[PDB]
Symmetry: C3
Subunit: 439 residues, 3 copies
Amino acid sequence: CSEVISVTSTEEVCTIQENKETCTFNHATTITLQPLQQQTCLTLNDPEKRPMGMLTVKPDGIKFRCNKKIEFFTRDHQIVSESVHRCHRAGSCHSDECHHVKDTDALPEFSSEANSRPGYTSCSSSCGCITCDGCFFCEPSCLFHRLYAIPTTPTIYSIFYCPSWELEVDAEISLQREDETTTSTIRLLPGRTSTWNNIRFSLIGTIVPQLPILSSAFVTNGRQTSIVKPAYAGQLQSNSVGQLQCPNLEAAKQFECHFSRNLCTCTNALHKVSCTCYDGSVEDHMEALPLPQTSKNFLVFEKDRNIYAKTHVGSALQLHIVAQDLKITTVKHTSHCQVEASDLSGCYSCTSGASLTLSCKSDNGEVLANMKCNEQTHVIRCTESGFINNILLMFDTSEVAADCTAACPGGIVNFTIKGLLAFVNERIISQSYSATDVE
Amino acid sequence: CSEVISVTSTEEVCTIQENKETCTFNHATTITLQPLQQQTCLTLNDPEKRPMGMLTVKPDGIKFRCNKKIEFFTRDHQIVSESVHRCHRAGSCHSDECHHVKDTDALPEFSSEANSRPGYTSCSSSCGCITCDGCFFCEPSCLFHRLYAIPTTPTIYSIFYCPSWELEVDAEISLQREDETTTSTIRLLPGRTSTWNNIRFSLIGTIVPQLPILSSAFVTNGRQTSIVKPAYAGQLQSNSVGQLQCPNLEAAKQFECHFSRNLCTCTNALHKVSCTCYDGSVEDHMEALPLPQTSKNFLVFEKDRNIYAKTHVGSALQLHIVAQDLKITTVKHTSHCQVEASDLSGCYSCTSGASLTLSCKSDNGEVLANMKCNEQTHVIRCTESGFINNILLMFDTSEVAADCTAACPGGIVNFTIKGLLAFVNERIISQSYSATDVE
Amino acid sequence: CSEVISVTSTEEVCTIQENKETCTFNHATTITLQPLQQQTCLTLNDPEKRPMGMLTVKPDGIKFRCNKKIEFFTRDHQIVSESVHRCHRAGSCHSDECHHVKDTDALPEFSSEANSRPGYTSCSSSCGCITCDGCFFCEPSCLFHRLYAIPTTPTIYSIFYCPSWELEVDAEISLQREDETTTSTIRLLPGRTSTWNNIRFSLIGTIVPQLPILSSAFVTNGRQTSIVKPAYAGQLQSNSVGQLQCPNLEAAKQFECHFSRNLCTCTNALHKVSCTCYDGSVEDHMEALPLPQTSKNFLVFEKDRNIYAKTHVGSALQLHIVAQDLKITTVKHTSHCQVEASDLSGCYSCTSGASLTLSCKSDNGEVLANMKCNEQTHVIRCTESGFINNILLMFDTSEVAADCTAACPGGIVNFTIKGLLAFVNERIISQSYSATDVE
Ligand SMILES: *[C@@H]1O[C@H](CO)[C@@H](O)[C@H](O)[C@H]1NC(C)=O
Ligand SMILES: *[C@@H]1O[C@H](CO)[C@@H](O)[C@H](O)[C@H]1NC(C)=O
Ligand SMILES: *[C@@H]1O[C@H](CO)[C@@H](O)[C@H](O)[C@H]1NC(C)=O
């Protein structure tokens, strides 16, 4: 098996029954486990029959459930322009009638059927003369201009942050007395002593690393999700998820959704005012950094519409087991180990890890190795046969060549890690898009 | 009483006095408490007189004090416009005199008494001809335009984030030997062994959940406060708290406070240039999400100008008690329980919790129940009589109907929870406001 | 020495060798240390020879390594303008040729050698008449306008956040049996039992405070660094680090770097269109809040291109030591203490702490003092001689005068702390800068 570190102590508990009291001696064992998909073994025994069956714990990690906050709905959108200009003393082009135009004024002046769709209106005044537009008097030309936004795809996008991530620890827990194997599954919570078959498990300690990726906009296209650069309700931060503000789901499907100016910077030409803006299709921002999103210490995955995020190595659960009328003793599994390296793969200085594949053999039950590169420090759990490991280190250069020294409970094993890593680009787009439909 | 989980161990400490040494045996007890406004009982005893008095601990939760960072002062503001236009060869409307106008140039051209108030100037050039404004020569008309900002209410608004929240644990701690009751109050800190009367308390462990709402703009209108979507010093992020940048308190009262363009998008008309902007009155953003602000795991409340934020259920303090020359033993309080449900209330997918009210009886000293709905998992502390509980679950749909199964140390108790939850809208306002005072 | 709080327990471990089993009794000791640059002593002994040598632990704190995410490159930049206007029926000033100008169109119309540098183009149309520009026909004057950006200094700026900060604990660990001193240095990790000479150290607990400054833009000018108000890839948030978006290092040196409009708000004059923008030189934002950046609970320092950040007081490591075939016992060091105060210094309500200097004497081996002001609570480790302490309290007013009561294991010591603190201003600049080079 593996090698954990433990403490054995005495627990004395007095139960209060109806007008009655019954005290109980016990033995209890606090074991400190780095979850790491280990195989943590234990041995039970009473004073009388020293063999009583082996116990096995396999923590699937330390996970955090999300507590959503649906903040911000949006849709694949395409912002378009429109304009219409008149001569003097015609339509609304007189003293102050075009000058008192309202922002949301749906004009009955060649505004197409899409007038209802959200947007903004504006009144400009260009030169008016017999060589400026072609009228007969030299009176300024009023220019009605209308921006709005169409959708593109019949879907909706739910943006949400996630405060108050809640702790949980699920463990595959098996027991082998003489012949059989129960291998139940348990859901431990930070103070709530669960009881699978006959033993009480409690989550006494958590040493999670401070990981501030847990506060960031998870976007959802129904079944699909991703992480994104934050955007906040009411600010219309351009060129990020949600330069369109749709508050309600029904407000999205019916498409009553506000956006802001400062996106499309219009410049006048007196015939076809040119408005250039960003062609925001959020699906891109999603594709920039989607889920699941593994990394060195954490990984953030959805499972039936709930964004769990767990950690493997940087943390160390601290568990407390009580065998009813027994006592527990761990098992230290001494064994050397051999290491088969590989070539690095992926990006350097990225939220993802510089990938690897370190096969390793144990000539014995699976044991743990505290791998130590130049700076970083990871762990692996290599066993008798094969058992590759993808471990996602975090170097920050292009060329990498270092002497990473694994260390199993036997003798350390030096080796070498080489590779050439490429830098990714998050993304970029400046204002180079425009589209107008004049009528 | 309740049921906590404990460890009893031996502590041997040798005190160094002046050229002297005195060692001491002891008994010590580490108990793991989910604060939850419990009533955690304990029983003291020496080898000689096994009754020595009961001890009672009632943790008020795990709280975080704030360490302010006053970043950003602002005021209820209303941005206004003004303009004045001239004919040719008059005032400053000649070769390049209007073209070299400075940004902060307080012009002596019909700029009212409010000229001193912050803002911006601009020089436009509209058509000039005998039908454009009414002058006699066909030379462009220079247009002086001035934006500025007035206050509305004689108050000030302090924006501040809060890094380095500090840990604290206050506990109501009572003792009952034979006749009386001391019920002191203690302030435990993460490593500093306090000593109330004759026993040493130390905060050995904290399992707080990762809660990234603790980094967000707390706004303060003196006695009142609230949480808000972040805004940063120097960016003038429109339509959020502080499109006005006031650095100093005295700089606010005297009102020397900068704001930026990109708020009011002006469009020319040669007589009354129309500038539309947001009517930012921060009191609104405050009313969007004020304090106190309870939720499922945490609540954030101010108490005498200090923003504490504590947690109840998601966490589990780990305490370490030492009775001087005694030993401690907990008490397990077996008792079944009955549950009286209620109807859900509030919002779904919101930082607030889907409210409930679960009365429950214990037929014995107050005990703990590990309530388990479909996904969520809360705890309650129901007792002999009445004792409602508001618990703020976190469902994420409109209709909700599930089989939540409470679980007391006796037998579990199935029941059903139904409700219809409504979605709230954070807020939204596009540029639909404008106000001008031409003279 | 100091006074720590401990637990002594029994550990029984059975090692599995090749087809062999060997069990081992032991003694183990879990000590709870607030790192605080203490001198935590310990005493070893077996049943036979009760003197076996003193042990000394000196934790350098609880530190967090950064796992970079290079997001955003930029450079000291200066944005400039340019323009050129023509008469009618000349160049590209006809029906719709200036009106179909592209955004990134490098025009062969007096666009200087710097045309290649990034920017934006625009076509305006001012009055055209015999008194508007001086042509002979009264046809509008097309105005070609070009914004771009030059660099200033031949350096590059790396912006990066830092998710998944990893835990580490380095400790100076010495031992003194009879004559000599080994004073090794150890690197403890959250679950990985290190072994310096003959004893196993493990990091069983961490009570770090929730500190949300650990998610903020660290900017780097090569050897220099600082903390800054966040900016995100693709949003071009004006007046903060990176209104220029340079994705790649090579893309910066060659200077192919995008920026956005909404910075320089141009206003037409038909000869010299005036464009005013912010003169962003990031070195300023760096100087606003540079590293190292000490505070009350944490400090964030770089050491060979790696941003460590450690904490001193608000936290309490929980360590677990095992002496091979011995047992450990702490030492309590009773001693009164004298305190020499000082005058406060620095800012109030700032991420930095209100500075102090509290000399203090111990008349014995260095001991610990739980200093308690009106609200705050710090700790110091004063010793026989001198030993100043800079402790960085966090008051939030200008005038401060309170009765801070130190408390050593002997009798408390009242004193008084006075001072006058000044408020700092983060920074501010509105649009008051412009520069044009017409040709
Ligand atoms: C492994 O590499 C380390 C470098 O840190 C070196 O100190 C050690 O001697 C090496 N072990 C070998 C070569 O067996
Ligand atoms: C309570 O509901 C659970 C569903 O999770 C079910 O398994 C159990 O049998 C129920 N108990 C009853 C009906 O007594
Ligand atoms: C020290 O000040 C405290 C105020 O909190 C007071 O209660 C105590 O009596 C003082 N001790 C003295 C004056 O010795």
